[PDB]
Structure formats: structure tokens, C-alpha cells
Nucleic acid binder design. Structure first.
Ligand code: MG
Ligand code: MG
Ligand code: MG
Ligand code: MG
Ligand code: MG
Ligand code: MG
Ligand code: MG
Ligand code: MG
Ligand code: MG
Ligand code: MG
Ligand code: MG
Ligand code: MG
Ligand code: MG
Ligand code: MG
Ligand code: MG
Ligand code: MG
Ligand code: MG
Lengths: 141, 185, 124, 57
RNA sequence: ACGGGUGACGGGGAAUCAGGGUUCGAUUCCGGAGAGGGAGCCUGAGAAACGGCUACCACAUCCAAGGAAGGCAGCAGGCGCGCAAAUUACCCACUCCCGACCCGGGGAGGUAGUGACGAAAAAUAACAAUACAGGACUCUUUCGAGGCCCUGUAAUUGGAAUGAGUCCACUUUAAAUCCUUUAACGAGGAUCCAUUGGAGGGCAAGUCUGGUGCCAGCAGCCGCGGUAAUUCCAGCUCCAAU
């Protein structure tokens, strides 16, 4: 604070309120357009339909073909790309199937090797991909 | 509108640093020296001690001769003496801040059963309390974290309905004694 | 081995009662039936054991003691008059009907649709 | 390029080692007691630094 | 100011917190508002009432096609919606409410069923004797012994225990259930089998082994994978919470 006087509470409050909007973590949270462009809309998870099983090339130095999924969400109709995490788990996901998709952890930010993907798959056809990976539950058919 | 209470309170806290060796090395020491079941039973006592130290700090900022300080500090010192973590020779508000977790962990019924010669080890003491062997003033108790008062420590005894006290022998002994003499007749 | 003590004894000239807390000392035994508690209280207070209504028994952990409530009456007519129906039915001197709440409400809402003396002709 | 037909290659072609049957692990206060006895009772100090719990050199 | 927006019912309060603060408050208490959306009224002390009426709008039920009957943001329940939420149960015994009333009614309320939202307590072993490895001790230059004396773990032997569970009875209770009391059974690999995540750093914890070979995949960030991977996939072991 630079003005200090006894009647400067209005100036301090109005200046602090106006300088909140230059904060990135405040402006994203308190303007609506971030939530509108958010494919989840404030939701932690979303159910979608698998449109395609796609292969996204990784970035620089780390060279791999990440196995992602082109999903169309149900609450919005909006098409995203989610990441099928572990080894061999794209076999347990079929085209035209309903998955549960969460974020990956950096709150709408591309993570690690992968261009642009900010979503991952936790369940497929109401059985979790972790259980299908560990062999606890089989894929119903 | 239902006639329920909903008043609950978490009785412990997790430490801010999850993997500090200088903390883990001293919690495992207390667990081993007092036969505790996990780290949460260390943290519950640390939690309780933090409340006693905090309330003593808020009483110590106020000046003397003010009846809130006099009344609440007197009540806190009386219950600390009544538990037995603070001796009667140091009934002053500044000596509360000298308390440690081991003084409270030595007032557990698991510790007192092991100290009073009723048990061999501190884990012997816990399984004896859990197996309904020990009563405190005619009340059979199976909580090892039962905080034993100074006056109530004199009446820690084995329960009447226990083979270690004056009771009927248990199921393994009576199964052997019936199986052998039922084969013998 | 079974001993009974009374606590907070208080006569009641309002419902014609004597109300007390029953302390049932039964070490080594299962908790004592209410009829036995009535007759052991009856010998204690010199009263016939058909006017004594005991209830609310909880036995403490460890099992050397049990606390309940008891209410003894000046006469059996007053014991019939100002007593709960469920305690009278536990004594057996009262029988309530078997009738449900669901079907009784449905019969009430079925006699709501008719007027005059057809309300008795709705049933059966 | 960008072949998606090579999913799970390493998990599929790795050699299956069956898990070996081993002894039961004691739990709770027993596990805390043996972890107290393994670190504060029987072990003796080492020249220079100490030794790691899983060091197999 | 006015206007617009509000993932705004408000408050008692909730979370986090050194001191300030920041965030939440649909939600059991108080006050407001509304009963599909608006509108209008009767009766009554009190209503612009909706488990009252009257329209119109939208939706929807029966029909001899003339007509009639609506209103679960009550309790259950169903569809739909979604990441996301329980039984078409029992009772007026409690709390209190209403009535002409000591007597009747109350999905208000209470009681159970589902219930890892979440909170409190707390099992998954404990102990002897044999080994065996230690320290401590008399002695010994050491190499060593012995046991006065302990501690540790050994798929070594061994009796003593106890709870989960099965189950009489009693209590509990409107009637029950459950807890508690207590008979009878009920443990040794006490198989009556504790998981979830990790093990390069951050960050506690293998440079063990095998396969793979910038592929598969790991990786919150830095980074690992290029034929000798502390980082993948598995085995063994260890660590953290339980
Ligand atoms: Mg990067
Ligand atoms: Mg709103
Ligand atoms: Mg509110
Ligand atoms: Mg809302
Ligand atoms: Mg209204
Ligand atoms: Mg509606
Ligand atoms: Mg209206
Ligand atoms: Mg209605
Ligand atoms: Mg109404
Ligand atoms: Mg839910
Ligand atoms: Mg009632
Ligand atoms: Mg209700
Ligand atoms: Mg188990
Ligand atoms: Mg590994
Ligand atoms: Mg690390
Ligand atoms: Mg380390
Ligand atoms: Mg790593």
C-alpha cells in the first residue's frame, strides 16, 4: 500500500479490486469465458462416446506414438481428445463406446509429452480401465 | 428437521511434510515404546497437547487478576494434575508449555497395565486390555487409550470374569480339559 | 446372586404411583427378565406383583449391573387406567388389533369417495 | 507413420513370471513393532554413513 | 446513480488460517419466496391458499367422441437428465401439532432398510522354552568361554488366551432389529490369508534380476526409454499410510 490515510479504505478497496483482474488465476476463475471454453463446464468428469482411436505423435526429445481417443461428450456434444493412459489399454476401448473422462491434472493444460491433450480415460463401458489393466474385472461383451 | 446431533470433530491432524525422516524416526520410537497401533494414535495425542498448549498461550497473554484467566487457567491446571501429566509441585500456568507427548502417553491404560505388573510387555498390555481382562473401579474396560487418573490408578486390577483373575478358565483350556477327559471318558 | 436395589424413589399422588430406578446387580449372569424383577421388587416393597411395571433396562459394559425404570401402582384399576397400552400388552392384560396403517388409510380414503350410510358397506 | 497397431507390445511379449507364494505379513501394531525392533533395537551403527534398507550391491 | 451480470435467497454459521485475511453458506434454526408459467377470486380472524376455485398458456389422463378429471419444489417410487445422491418398509410408543377432544388423526415426527459424504473408538495376535546373532558382564594380549543378566527373529516345539462368525435365552422395542448381558460351539501355515500407491530427484524407499530397445510405455515438474533402463513391463525386496 502507498496511500495510507484514515479515509482511504475506499481507495484501497477499489484499487485492490481493479488489480485483481490482472491476476491470471483470478481472471480465469471469475470471468465466465474460461468456463464456457472449458469442455467440462466446471465438472470433474464427463461421459462421452468414443468416435475414434487415434495416435498422437509426442513432442521433442521424447519420441513416441501416444495412444489417444477422439471422444464426443454427452452434456455438450463437444468433441475432445482424451488420453488412454497405460500399456495396451486401447484394446479395452472400442469405437462407439461410452467412456468416463477426467482431466489429467494441470487443470486444462497440456501435460508432459503430449500436444494439447488435457483429458484422460478412467472408465470404459461402466468398468474402470485400471481394473481392466490389472485383470480384476474383464470387459463385458 | 430431524432430532439428531451432527456434532463431530476430527481428533487428530496429519503433518504438513509427508516424508521427513527427522519426524518419522521420532514417531516410530514413540509407537514402539508405547505399543501404539499406527501414526494416528501419535497424532491424536499431539493434537490434544496442541490444544492444551494453545489454550495456555491464550490464557498467558491476558494479564493476571482477571477472572477469565484465573478461572480457566485454574480449571486447566486442575484437570492436568487430575490426569497426572503435570505434578502438583508445578501448578503454574507457565509449566503447561513444558509438557511433552510422552507424559500423556504414559497415562494410557496400556502403559499403566504394563507399569503396574499386570502384564509383561507393552503389547502384552494391549492384548490383555483388548481381551477384556482388566477393569478400572469395577468397570471392565477394553480401550487402551483410556487415560488413567491419579486417584483412579490405585484400582487397576484384573477383571473378575477373566482366568487371570478369579474367573472361569477360558475356552482353549476348557476345550483341552474336556477333550482329554472325554476321550478318557 | 441376583440382587436388586432402588434409587430415586418418589411417590406420585398424581397418577397414583411409586416411581423408582431399578439397579439390578447380576454378576456372572445374563440380564434378568422383567417378571423376575417385578417379583423381587414385590417382596422388597411388600406389594402384590401384578401392579408393578418395569421397563427400560440397560446393562453396563462388563455386565455386573443393569439400570432400568419401575412404576408400581396403588391398585390394578389405576394400573389399567393411566398406563401405556404397550406396557399393558407386555403384561398381557391388553390386546390391540392386528390392523395395519397402510390398509386402514386406504380404507379411509375409500370411504371418502362415498356419502351417507355407504361407509359401512364399503368394508367387506 | 503413426502406427496404432502396435499397442501393448511390451506387456504382450514380456515373459510371464508367476508370483511366488511367500509368508504372511503381520499387520497393524505388530508391523509397527517389528519395524521398531528392526531399526531401534537390534541394528548397530556403521562406519561413516549408515546402510540403506534395500541396498543390494 | 442508473443499467447489465451473478454457477446471487439472506442471515445464524462452515472450511482454511500465526496476525490479518481468502473461500463457501441449495441444506435440519430464523426470516423470505414459490408450488408447471402467469393472472384473478371465494370462504375465513388469518390466503391472492394451489394435497381450494376460475380462466388462458404448455404438458398430460379417461371416453359410447357427447363430456370429465389434473398439478409429487410432501413421503416412497419411476422416467429423463447427468460425474453426481437411498425403501413404492413399520409405527403414532417418543416429540409435539390439530379437532367438539383424557378416547381420534398426523409419510410432521419417530423406527428400521440402502449407505467407505464424513466423524469417534478399535482386531488381523500375545507369551514361555529351545536354538542362533548381538550388547552387557567375570576373565582373556588376542583367539575365547561361561552364564550370573537381557533383547532381537526362526516354516523349532508348546500350551495359555480372546475376538469376528454360528447360535439358546433375556434385555432392547409400538413390535422388532442392532448394541449390551450371557449359556453352547468357535484359531496355528491362528488360509479366520490388508490393501492402496510408490522405490532417480523433489520425496521415505534396490544402481537386484529378466524381458524390451526412443518401440511399448513411465513421467504432477525436472526427466527415463537409442542392446549394460536406479524411471517402462514383470519377479524379489524395501518405503509410506493403514
Ligand atoms: Mg515438458
Ligand atoms: Mg439463483
Ligand atoms: Mg443457506
Ligand atoms: Mg441453485
Ligand atoms: Mg404462497
Ligand atoms: Mg415439477
Ligand atoms: Mg396460486
Ligand atoms: Mg401436492
Ligand atoms: Mg400447502
Ligand atoms: Mg453420490
Ligand atoms: Mg404420537
Ligand atoms: Mg419425512
Ligand atoms: Mg484379515
Ligand atoms: Mg520395479
Ligand atoms: Mg522421488
Ligand atoms: Mg532418498
Ligand atoms: Mg520414477
Amino acid at each position: 500500500g502507498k496511500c495510507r490515510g484514515l479515509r482511504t479504505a475506499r481507495k484501497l478497496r477499489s484499487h485492490r479490486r481493479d488489480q485483481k483482474w490482472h491476476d491470471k488465476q483470478y481472471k480465469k476463475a471469475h470471468l465466465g469465458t474460461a468456463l464456457k471454453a472449458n469442455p467440462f463446464g466446471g465438472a470433474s468428469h464427463a461421459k462421452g462416446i468414443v468416435l475414434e482411436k487415434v495416435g498422437v505423435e509426442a513432442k521433442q526429445p521424447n519420441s513416441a506414438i501416444r495412444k489417444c481417443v477422439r471422444v464426443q461428450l454427452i452434456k455438450n456434444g463437444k468433441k475432445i481428445t482424451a488420453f488412454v493412459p497405460n500399456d495396451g489399454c486401447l484394446n479395452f476401448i472400442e469405437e462407439n463406446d461410452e467412456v468416463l473422462v477426467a482431466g489429467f491434472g494441470r487443470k486444462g493444460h497440456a501435460v508432459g509429452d503430449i500436444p494439447g491433450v488435457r483429458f484422460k480415460v478412467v472408465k470404459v463401458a461402466n468398468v474402470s480401465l485400471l481394473a481392466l489393466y490389472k485383470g480384476k474385472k474383464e470387459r463385458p461383451r | 428437521p430431524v432430532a439428531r446431533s451432527w456434532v463431530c470433530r476430527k481428533t487428530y491432524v496429519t503433518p504438513r511434510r509427508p516424508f521427513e525422516k527427522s519426524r518419522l524416526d521420532q514417531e516410530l520410537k514413540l509407537i514402539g515404546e508405547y505399543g501404539l497401533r499406527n501414526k494416528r494414535e501419535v497424532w491424536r495425542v499431539k493434537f490434544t497437547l496442541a490444544k492444551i498448549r494453545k489454550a495456555a498461550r491464550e490464557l498467558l497473554t491476558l494479564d493476571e487478576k482477571d477472572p477469565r484467566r484465573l478461572f480457566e487457567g485454574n480449571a486447566l491446571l486442575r484437570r492436568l494434575v487430575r490426569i497426572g501429566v503435570l505434578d502438583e509441585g508445578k501448578m503454574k500456568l507457565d509449566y503447561i508449555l513444558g509438557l511433552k507427548i510422552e507424559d500423556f502417553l504414559e497415562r494410557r491404560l496400556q502403559t499403566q497395565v504394563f507399569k503396574l505388573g499386570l502384564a509383561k510387555s507393552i503389547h502384552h498390555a494391549r492384548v490383555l486390555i483388548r481381551q477384556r481382562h482388566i477393569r478400572v473401579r469395577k468397570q471392565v474396560v477394553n480401550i487402551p487409550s483410556f487415560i488413567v487418573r491419579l486417584d483412579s490408578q490405585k484400582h487397576i486390577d484384573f477383571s473378575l470374569r477373566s482366568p487371570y483373575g478369579g474367573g472361569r478358565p477360558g475356552r482353549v483350556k476348557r476345550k483341552n480339559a474336556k477333550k482329554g477327559q472325554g476321550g478318557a471318558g | 446372586t441376583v440382587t436388586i436395589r432402588t434409587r430415586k424413589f418418589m411417590t406420585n399422588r398424581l397418577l397414583q404411583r411409586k416411581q423408582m430406578v431399578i439397579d439390578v446387580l447380576h454378576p456372572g449372569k445374563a440380564t434378568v427378565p422383567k417378571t423376575e424383577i417385578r417379583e423381587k421388587l414385590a417382596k422388597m416393597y411388600k406389594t402384590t406383583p401384578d401392579v408393578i411395571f418395569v421397563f427400560g433396562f440397560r446393562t453396563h459394559f462388563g455386565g455386573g449391573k443393569t439400570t432400568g425404570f419401575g412404576m408400581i401402582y396403588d391398585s390394578l384399576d389405576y394400573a389399567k387406567k393411566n398406563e401405556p397400552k404397550h406396557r399393558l400388552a407386555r403384561h398381557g392384560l391388553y390386546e390391540k388389533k392386528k390392523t395395519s396403517r397402510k390398509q386402514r388409510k386406504e380404507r379411509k380414503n375409500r370411504m371418502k369417495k362415498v356419502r351417507g350410510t355407504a361407509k359401512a358397506n364399503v368394508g367387506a | 507413420h503413426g502406427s496404432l497397431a502396435r499397442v501393448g507390445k511390451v506387456r504382450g511379449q514380456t515373459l510371464k513370471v508367476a508370483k511366488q507364494e511367500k509368508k504372511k505379513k503381520r499387520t497393524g501394531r505388530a508391523k509397527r513393532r517389528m519395524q521398531y525392533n528392526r531399526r531401534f533395537v537390534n541394528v548397530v551403527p556403521t562406519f561413516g554413513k549408515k546402510k540403506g534398507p534395500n541396498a543390494n550391491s
